[PDB]
Every structure is written in structure tokens, then in C-alpha cells.
Design a binder for this molecule. Structure first.
Ligand SMILES: OC[C@H]1O[C@H](O[C@H]2[C@H](O)[C@@H](O)[C@@H](O)O[C@@H]2CO)[C@H](O)[C@@H](O)[C@@H]1O
Ligand SMILES: OC[C@H]1O[C@H](O[C@H]2[C@H](O)[C@@H](O)[C@@H](O)O[C@@H]2CO)[C@H](O)[C@@H](O)[C@@H]1O
Ligand SMILES: OC[C@H]1O[C@H](O[C@H]2[C@H](O)[C@@H](O)[C@@H](O)O[C@@H]2CO)[C@H](O)[C@@H](O)[C@@H]1O
Ligand SMILES: OC[C@H]1O[C@H](O[C@H]2[C@H](O)[C@@H](O)[C@@H](O)O[C@@H]2CO)[C@H](O)[C@@H](O)[C@@H]1O
Ligand SMILES: [Ca+2]
Length: 1007
């Protein structure tokens, strides 16, 4: 049962021997002999082709074996295969860490497969650089051979690097070059409020049921409560919160309570709570939120009881829609509407270039208030007005200056870029011809701060340079505007008149406290109060000799000395902060002040004429009575008299006595030292703000920025773009300081008698790190289906799960207290939902079910993998378990080596019988299927063309092709080479053995 050559001691291995009628086969490994005629084909044999198919199957359909999102697969999915083609050569059982890209073994179509091969060649170096591009007409057999070659090469590179890090990067780079897997399939469009290039609305589906909602009532703003009109755009930025969901509404109330009691809650400090809110993005949320905030404020503070009660909590609305004020008034002015008519009148008549400004008359009429003869109180819709805001004529133009100074694309910049753009923006601000800054700021602010029936709001960036550390540099308008502010405190009160003369010149008068009309004789304090303003926007203004400008100061101001507050000069303006050295003018017996093209009593700059300089383009002069005491204060305290209408604010002298300060710019820099922190500096300057008559300080939103760079707000970290609603400089400081700095700023403000406004931002949340599979539809800013998009009811990977530790800690945590103290909040029925809020679920973590939609995420319409007929692959978590065929186990019945009658056959991948072909098995044996498809296993030399020319083969009874071995017969000994072909007429070596074969193949000698 062993065969040795007794003369050499050496054993014969892989040796077929005839002994009489018996044949003995001595095996390859040990030379152990068996009856050759009883060798049987191994029924469990599989081909090398089948071994390859199976190696690449998924190890299992576990979450652990196949990267997924809610069970769905993506173009980025890696998986654990059953086996790894280790080092490109050796199939080896996979470890749990042997993840491989699905795109190594699967492609959505042959085109993408072809493109994959070209990419892996060109950028991966995973095929020879010489090889020709595979084209659209490329053959499947050819694609598969080179796909297998890429795998072999990938495996080789993994073996040498010991890593797949490189392959993660390479594969993702390839993925993003496919339209179906990048922004190109997402219909990028910036129309309307698609600020980030488009939206996907979330829709109900059986495929993503955990993301369903019964709400998502969109665009239900002041003009669209019943949903039967168009309304404002629901979608604006990032992850849109569904504020029509009663559970979300209760969480919005919870958050509002957190802000209003922030000091108590986070610092056990009753001096560090906010006093009012700004409602951000009013026209982009369910208007129910306005009544919800109302009702909370009513219950906590009795807002509607009196002016004294309402005015202790000044609230504002970011409500741009021109129909909003009528509605806000109807619901009780719980938060002050803006007057966007009036701000636009300033834009059209003062703020434009000399060739743009329109007739000044618009200032009188285009407003919630007609100001020709404003001689009454509590008669109009109360409102705030402003000339600029952090995002109104600031952020676009400042980005334009940065683009100009650096040449980088619009809205892209680092800190150095910003500084360089800021230098260009300030130089422009200091020019007569401005490209990026508004014109006539002193005149615009003069209108802002001398208007009756208005709460003016002063913008930080008109006092201090927008970019810089907080309050680091002043604008050219700082002296002008603060002079206006102190002057407003001291003198501005009573009735108002405005008119425009035949020369287009505006006269604006306030009579002083105690006088409503030009004919009122006034009270004690009227005399040295009031103000007279002359404005032109005509840089070429020239009065003809004899023509005049008359300010009708009124019957309280007959035969009276006036002095200038502001006069225009050739190069700028002159400010007078008190009577000293201020030019004077006297009213006549009627109370009229007269100006002409001639100076008054030799006083330079007292003639009316046009100028053009960096301050004034046109004309500005401002006059007040001389001889006011230094402590004169023309403000009115709010009455505690019961209201007789359902309203918080009323437009009257007490409300008018308020000034809001928007105390930030988007372009405040991150502090380099603790002393540079915005909130530190606010705390130190509370008495200064007070001295300007600021009664409420609007702080920036205090939420830590998501820092994700996806919009300006998360580039310059203003606090409008955040993951964690309750994290106010708490996990780490915000741009303005730590939460302790915020609390100290609130306390300092309160010590000075100022209120503080919390910026309430219910519209959206950014940068949620948890992926989620959600059925979506590409849509416009109103959630109208984007008709040309293929993304309609398509599963898409969103970033919707998370919200930070403070949302977790505080989410829904004050609802108990609110229900206990103010049960009436929980029975109110809101007009859009037509139901109450729902405190029964606390939101501690966000997910898709709580959102209306998302900006487009550039993952591509087909990022979530589907079969040809549109069926989604899935582990079975959210829909039917279904995997690509290459990942799945196959039914092996009638495939591979099949016995039929007395013969074995081989059926290929198409269940087709294989004829006249060699097939190798998984352990390296070769078999041959003859021209009738029958395996040859007859142990006799047979002629076969493997292609040219004909060779002599021998197949043992198990079907294996005999190779690299001797066959000793009674008629002679023959040698078959490494290809299983009989050797004739040469000398060969096989290991230590040298064989000489004659022309018939008979062994002549060995050694
Ligand atoms: O004409 C309908 C018009 O209305 C809305 O736009 C408003 C927006 O809601 C306001 O906040 C503000 O910007 O004024 C706009 C004009 O009223 C829709 O959002 C818009 O698509 C639509 O054109
Ligand atoms: O901030 C959300 C707000 O943005 C848009 O409003 C513009 C407005 O159209 C302009 O007049 C400009 O001066 O400033 C605003 C803020 O950028 C939307 O139109 C509005 O509906 C939305 O609430
Ligand atoms: O608010 C006083 C103002 O009212 C009228 O103008 C309104 C007009 O009634 C409205 O339809 C609205 O859309 O805008 C106008 C103001 O911009 C008077 O015509 C006007 O003289 C008066 O100042
Ligand atoms: O065909 C391009 C098309 O795109 C946008 O139109 C949207 C539209 O805004 C939607 O409300 C809805 O009807 O689907 C359309 C896309 O199929 C652009 O607004 C439009 O100008 C343009 O024609
Ligand atoms: Ca919204």
C-alpha cells in the first residue's frame, strides 16, 4: 500500500500502477495506495466558479454583517462576505471585521459596472494603466473577468497595507461621481426659499412607517390658517420642525418656559431670566405658535391687563408678510409686528443711491401709521421698525465685499477672508459712492428715532463695525446715532406732523410731551421739548432766492430759541450733543422756524442745500429747543389702567418710549481672550445702553452652533443654526461666552433696568448625526412636489436623529409644572390644528416623524439601493427581506455537478449543460465534460483539444484529470505533465525527479 523505488529509497506519489487486472493509485500527499478502479467522484464537489459565487455571498443577513439604515442598503454599504479571497489567491473564512464594499461584487447595471472598472483603473490603479476603457457596448463576460481582477487586486492591496481605510475613501469617491448618487439627481434649485438648493418633504409610507405622521400641516401662516390659500413657505433651512404636531407644540412651549426661566433653571438665579422673545421665521411655521406663546405669556404675566403689565415683557416678531400685522392685531398683539411697509419707505427714499431714491412722500403714507397728522394714541397697530438687521441689508452685502476682496465664490470664506472683506466693506461704508452699504444712514436713523407710534430698533452694525471682536471698532455713525438716541430720550414726544414741499423737502416735527396738534398750547414741560427735522434726498438741491423751508413747531413754541442737533457739511455732518456751541435759530410769533439758501445770522451750515458725502446725500438738519435742563426726560411711563380691548401692547407715548437694541452682527469674531467675549462686554456696558434709552436688549440666539458650514449661520456661528435647542453656551461656550457669561449679562442688564430678549427659533434644527431612512419627495419651499424630479415617494437617507444632551435633559421637563400652574394652557384649542397641545409625550430626541422635511443632502435619488423593478433591498427590518442576488444564497438544485443515469454532467450559471470543456473544482482538481456533456472517468488515454493542438489526457475513475505523475502499465510507463498532457520525446523534471520519455511516451530512464 506504499510504492518505493528500493534502489533510491524514494516513494512514488501521485502514481497509477497496473498489477495484473488490478490498478493501484498512490496519492499525492503520502503515496498511500488505493484501488484505482473504486475511486469515486466526490458528490459534494463544487466548481471554482461556484466557490467564487459563494465566497462573495453575505456572511449573514444580520445588522452586523451588512451596513444599513433601518434595514435599507446604500451605495456606501459594506458587508461581511462568507469568504475573503485573501491576498487575491486564497479563499479564507471571513472574520467579523473583514468588511468589503458591496460595489466590489454588485452594480446596479452594466454601464455602472463598466464605469466602476474605468474608475478603479484610473484612480484606484487596480487594473493595468494600459488597458482600454470599457464602453457602453462592453460584454458581460468581459466585465465580470475584470471585476474579479479588481477584487483580486483589492485583496492584494488590503493584504499589503493591512487596512481598508484607503478603500473606504476610494469607493466613496467613485460613488459620488454617479448622478444617481450625487446632487445631480436632486434637481438643485435656489428659487424661492430653497436657500440650500432644494427640499425633500417627508411623506407617509409603509416602507418607513416609524417616520409617519398624522400632522405635517404646512404653510399654515397668518394668511393660510384653514389651508385653503398659499401661505408663507414652510421650508426654509436644514431640518424643518413640524410645528403643526401638538406634541411638538407642547415641546415648543416647554422650550419657551426654559428660556423665560433660564436663570432660575440653570443657575438658581432669578436675575438671569429673559424678559421677552423674538419669534424667528414667523412666516415659515404654523401660526398656532403665536397664540401658544400669547397664552403662556398671558397666564404667567397677565400681559393683557394693562400697559404697565404688557410693557414689562417686550416681544417682537420676525414677520415679513404684509398681511401679518392685521392678524397679529386680531390675536391681541401678543408680540409686536414689524412695520415692513415703513422700513421699505426708508429703503426707497433714503437708503438708495442718489439716482435711485424716490420722492420722500412715501415715508408719510407707506406704513401701519399715517404720519401727516398723527395726533392720537391707542389708535394704530403697535409695531417696531428698524433700518438694518443682522440679516437685512447686512449679511448679503458683507458677503459681496468678501467675494470682491478675496475673489472666492460667494459665501465661501475663512477668518482671514472675512477680515479682508470687512476692510473693503468699511472703506465702502466710509465712501460717498457706496456699493455695499446703505446711503443716508443719519437721515434713516433720524426718521427711525423721531417717528411717533413706533418702537425703533437700533442695529449693532450701525454703531460698531459688523466684523471685529464685539464692540472693537465704531462705525462713522456711532456719534451721530448715539446723539440721536440721547436726544430722543430728552426731547422726542407728543404729536407728529410730516409733509413734503414743492421742492421735495421733508419736514418732520414732534411737538413735545403734552401737545398732540400744532395748535395745542401744551403743558409745563412741552416748552423745551419736541424736535424739528429737515430732510432732502436731492444731492443737487438748490433753493431759489426767496424760497424757504418752514418747520411748524406749533403754538407751544412761539418766539423760541432752537439749537442744532445735526447739521450737514460738505464732507460729513456736525453733531451737537447739548446746547454748547450749537448754531441757533428762532421761531416766529407763530412757532414757525424758517430756513433758506442763506445762512442764519452768519452761522455756517444753516442754509438748506444739497450735499454728497459719506453721511448725507441730500440734506439733513435736526433742531431742538435750547435751554432744556440736562436731566430732561420726555418719556412716558405705562399706565396701570385696565385695557378695554383684548391686547397686550398699545401704540401710545409709553410704548413709543421704548427702544430695542439688536446687540449683535453675524460677523462678530470668535473671542481670542475671555475679556473679548460678547456677553462679558454686554455685562460691562449695561449703563451705556441705558444712557441711549435702550429699554430692551435683543441678544443673539444663544444656542451653540452646529458648526457644520451648511449655511452662513453655521459658518459664522451666530446661534441660528444649532443641533441642541437647550445648549446655551453650556456644553462649551457659544460665540458670545459660556452660559455663566450669558447669565451675568442678563443680570447686569436687569441691574441697569433693561429687559433682555430671547431669540426663539422654532423653525428648524441642524446637523443631527443619526441617519434614518425616510420616504421623501423633492419639493419646493411650500412642499409642492417637484414635478420633474424622480424623487417622489422614494426612500432616502436623512440626518434626523439626535438633538444633544440638553434636549435630552430638559425636553418636556417643564410640562408638569406648566400644567400644575397654568392648566388653562392645556385646554386652549389652536386655529390651525383645531385642537389642544399634547404634553403626553416628551421630546427628548428628534427623529423624522417630528419634521416636515430637510434641505437636499446630495446623497442622490438612488442612494438607497433598489432592484431593477424598483423593489428596495432590506435586511427585513422595515420591509421584506431582499438582498442583491450576489449577496444571497442560491438554490443549487440542478446546478453544478449533477449525476444523471450513469453519467455526471455540469450545469453552468444558466442551468445549461456544459459540453467539451474542462472545469476545475474548488480544491484544484480538473474535470472534463465531453462533447455529449458527460464527465470522462474511464482511466484511458484520450485525445482532447483544449484549443490547439490535440493533447493526450487520462481521467481517473473519480473523473479527476491525472497530472504531474507516472502511469506504469504492463506495456510501459508514461508521464503526464502539469496540464495533464502526456509528454513525448523529451526530458522533463518534476521536483527531484528527471524523466526521459521516448517518441511513444514510454519512460526510457528516470533519476
Ligand atoms: O404671493 C404669494 C407669496 O407669498 C409668500 O411670500 C411672502 C412671505 O411669506 C413673507 O414672509 C414675505 O417675504 O413676503 C412674501 C410676499 O407676501 C410665499 O412664501 C411666496 O412663495 C409667494 O410668492
Ligand atoms: O429669515 C427668514 C425670512 O427670510 C426671508 O425674508 C427676507 C425679506 O424677504 C427681505 O426683505 C430681507 O430684507 O430680509 C428678510 C430676511 O432675510 C423670507 O422671505 C421670509 O418669509 C422669512 O421668514
Ligand atoms: O396705515 C395708514 C395708511 O393706510 C392706507 O394705506 C395702506 C392701505 O390701506 C393698505 O391696503 C396697505 O396695503 O398699505 C397701505 C400703507 O402702506 C392709506 O392709503 C395711507 O395713506 C395711510 O398712510
Ligand atoms: O422644469 C424646471 C422647472 O423647475 C421649477 O418648477 C417646479 C415648481 O416650482 C414646482 O412648484 C412644481 O410645479 O414642480 C416644478 C418642477 O417640475 C422652477 O420653479 C421652474 O421655473 C422650472 O420651469
Ligand atoms: Ca417650517
Amino acid at each position: 500500500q506504499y510504492y518505493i523505488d528500493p534502489t533510491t529509497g524514494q516513494p512514488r506519489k501521485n502514481f497509477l500502477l497496473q498489477n495484473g487486472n488490478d490498478w493501484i493509485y498512490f496519492d499525492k500527499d503520502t503515496g498511500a495506495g488505493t484501488n484505482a478502479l473504486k475511486l469515486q467522484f466526490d458528490k459534494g464537489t463544487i466548481s471554482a466558479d461556484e466557490q467564487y459565487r459563494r465566497g462573495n455571498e453575505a456572511y449573514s443577513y444580520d445588522d452586523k454583517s451588512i451596513e444599513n439604515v433601518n434595514g435599507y442598503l446604500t451605495a456606501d454599504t459594506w458587508y461581511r462576505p462568507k469568504q475573503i479571497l485573501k491576498d487575491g489567491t486564497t479563499w479564507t473564512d471571513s472574520k467579523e471585521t473583514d468588511m468589503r464594499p458591496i460595489l466590489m461584487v454588485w452594480w446596479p447595471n452594466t454601464v455602472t459596472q463598466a464605469y466602476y472598472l474605468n474608475y478603479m483603473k484610473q484612480y484606484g490603479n487596480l487594473l493595468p494603466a494600459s488597458l482600454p476603457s470599457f464602453s457602453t457596448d462592453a460584454d458581460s463576460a468581459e466585465l465580470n473577468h475584470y471585476s474579479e481582477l479588481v477584487q483580486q487586486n483589492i485583496e492584494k492591496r488590503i493584504s499589503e497595507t493591512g487596512s481598508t481605510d484607503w478603500l473606504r475613501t476610494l469607493m466613496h469617491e467613485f460613488v459620488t461621481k454617479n448622478s444617481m448618487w450625487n446632487k445631480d439627481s436632486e434637481n438643485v434649485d435656489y428659487g424661492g426659499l430653497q436657500l440650500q438648493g432644494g427640499f425633500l418633504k417627508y411623506v407617509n409610507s409603509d416602507l418607513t412607517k416609524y417616520a409617519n405622521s398624522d400632522w405635517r400641516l404646512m404653510n399654515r401662516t397668518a394668511t393660510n390658517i384653514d389651508g385653503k390659500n398659499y401661505g408663507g413657505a414652510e421650508f426654509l433651512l436644514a431640518n424643518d420642525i413640524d410645528n403643526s404636531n401638538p406634541v411638538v407644540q407642547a415641546e415648543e412651549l416647554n422650550w419657551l418656559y426654559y428660556l423665560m426661566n433660564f436663570g432660575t433653571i440653570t443657575g438658581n438665579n432669578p436675575e438671569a431670566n429673559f424678559d421677552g422673545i423674538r419669534v424667528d421665521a414667523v412666516d415659515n411655521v404654523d401660526v398656532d405658535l403665536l397664540s401658544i406663546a400669547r397664552d403662556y405669556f398671558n397666564a404667567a404675566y397677565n400681559m393683557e391687563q394693562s400697559d404697565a403689565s404688557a410693557n414689562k415683557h417686550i416681544n417682537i416678531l420676525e414677520d415679513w408678510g404684509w398681511d401679518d400685522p392685521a392678524y397679529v392685531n386680531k390675536i391681541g398683539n401678543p408680540q409686536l409686528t414689524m412695520d415692513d411697509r415703513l422700513r421699505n419707505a426708508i429703503m426707497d427714499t433714503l437708503s438708495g443711491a442718489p439716482d435711485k431714491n424716490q420722492a420722500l412722500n412715501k415715508l408719510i403714507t407707506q406704513s401701519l401709521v399715517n404720519r401727516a397728522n398723527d395726533n392720537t394714541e391707542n389708535a394704530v397697530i403697535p409695531s417696531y421698525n428698524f433700518v438694518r438687521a443682522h440679516d437685512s441689508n447686512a449679511q448679503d452685502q458683507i458677503r459681496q465685499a468678501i467675494q470682491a476682496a478675496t475673489g472666492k465664490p460667494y459665501g465661501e470664506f475663512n477668518l482671514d477672508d472675512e477680515k479682508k472683506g470687512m476692510e473693503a466693506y468699511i472703506n465702502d461704508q466710509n465712501s460717498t459712492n457706496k456699493k455695499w452699504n446703505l446711503y443716508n444712514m443719519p437721515s434713516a436713523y433720524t426718521i427711525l428715532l423721531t417717528n411717533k407710534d413706533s418702537v425703533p430698533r437700533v442695529y449693532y452694525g450701525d454703531l460698531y463695525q459688523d466684523g471685529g471682536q464685539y464692540m472693537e471698532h465704531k462705525t462713522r455713525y456711532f456719534d451721530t446715532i448715539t446723539n440721536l438716541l440721547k436726544t430722543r430720550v430728552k426731547y422726542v414726544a407728543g404729536g407728529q406732523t410730516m409733509s413734503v414741499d414743492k421742492n421735495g423737502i421733508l419736514t418732520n416735527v414732534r411737538f413735545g410731551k403734552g401737545a398732540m396738534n400744532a395748535t395745542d398750547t401744551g403743558t409745563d414741560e412741552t416748552r423745551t421739548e419736541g424736535i424739528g427735522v429737515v430732510i432732502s434726498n436731492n444731492t443737487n438741491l438748490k433753493l431759489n432766492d426767496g424760497e424757504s423751508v418752514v418747520l411748524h413747531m406749533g403754538a407751544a413754541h412761539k418766539n423760541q430759541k432752537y439749537r442744532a442737533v445735526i447739521l450737514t457739511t460738505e464732507d460729513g455732518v456736525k453733531n451737537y450733543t447739548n446746547d454748547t456751541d450749537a448754531p441757533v435759530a428762532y421761531t416766529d410769533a407763530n412757532g414757525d422756524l424758517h430756513f433758506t439758501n442763506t445762512n442764519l445770522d452768519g452761522q455756517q451750515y444753516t442754509a438748506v442745500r444739497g450735499y454728497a458725502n459719506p453721511d448725507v446725500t441730500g440734506y439733513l438738519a435736526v433742531w431742538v429747543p435750547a435751554g432744556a435742563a440736562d436731566d430732561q426726560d420726555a418719556r412716558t411711563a405705562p399706565s396701570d389702567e385696565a385695557h378695554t380691548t383684548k391686547t397686550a401692547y398699545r401704540s401710545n407715548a409709553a410704548l413709543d418710549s421704548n427702544v430695542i437694541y439688536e446687540g449683535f452682527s453675524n460677523f462678530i469674531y470668535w473671542p481670542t481672550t475671555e475679556s473679548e467675549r460678547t456677553n462679558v462686554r454686554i455685562a460691562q456696558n449695561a449703563d451705556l445702553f441705558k444712557s441711549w434709552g435702550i429699554t430692551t436688549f435683543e441678544l443673539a440666539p444663544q444656542y451653540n452652533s452646529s458648526k457644520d458650514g451648511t449655511f452662513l449661520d453655521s459658518i459664522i456661528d451666530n446661534g441660528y443654526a444649532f443641533t441642541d435647542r437647550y445648549d446655551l453656551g453650556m456644553s462649551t461656550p457659544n460665540k458670545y461666552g459660556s452660559d455663566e457669561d450669558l447669565r451675568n449679562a442678563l443680570q447686569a442688564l436687569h441691574k441697569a433696568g433693561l429687559q433682555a430678549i430671547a431669540d426663539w427659533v422654532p423653525d428648524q434644527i441642524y446637523n443631527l448625526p443619526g441617519k434614518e431612512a425616510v420616504t421623501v419627495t423633492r419639493s419646493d419651499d411650500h412642499g409642492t412636489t417637484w414635478e420633474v424630479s424622480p424623487i417622489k415617494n422614494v426612500v432616502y437617507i436623512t440626518n434626523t436623529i439626535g438633538g444633544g444632551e440638553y434636549q435630552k435633559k430638559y425636553g418636556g421637563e417643564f410640562l408638569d409644572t406648566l400644567q400644575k400652574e397654568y392648566p388653562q394652557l392645556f385646554s386652549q384649542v389652536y386655529p390651525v390644528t383645531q385642537t389642544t397641545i399634547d404634553p403626553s409625550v416628551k421630546i427628548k430626541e428628534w427623529s423624522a416623524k417630528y419634521f416636515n422635511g430637510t434641505n437636499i443632502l446630495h446623497r442622490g435619488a438612488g442612494y438607497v439601493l433598489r432592484s431593477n423593478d424598483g423593489k428596495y433591498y432590506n435586511l427585513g427590518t422595515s420591509t421584506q427581506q431582499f438582498l442583491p442576488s450576489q449577496l444571497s444564497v442560491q438554490d443549487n438544485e440542478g446546478y453544478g455537478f449533477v449525476k444523471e443515469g450513469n453519467n455526471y454532467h455540469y450545469y453552468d450559471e444558466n442551468k445549461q449543460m456544459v459540453k467539451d470543456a474542462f472545469i476545475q473544482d474548488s480544491v484544484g482538481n480538473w474535470y472534463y465534460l465531453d462533447k455529449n456533456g458527460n464527465m470522462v472517468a474511464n482511466q484511458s488515454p484520450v485525445e482532447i483539444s483544449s484549443n490547439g493542438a490535440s493533447g493526450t489526457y487520462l481521467f481517473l475513475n473519480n473523473g479527476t484529470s491525472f497530472r504531474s505523475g507516472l502511469v506504469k502499465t504492463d506495456a510501459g510507463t508514461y508521464y503526464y505533465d502539469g496540464d495533464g498532457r502526456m509528454v513525448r520525446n523529451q526530458t522533463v523534471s518534476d521536483g527531484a525527479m528527471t524523466y526521459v520519455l521516448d517518441e511513444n511516451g514510454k519512460l526510457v530512464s528516470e533519476s
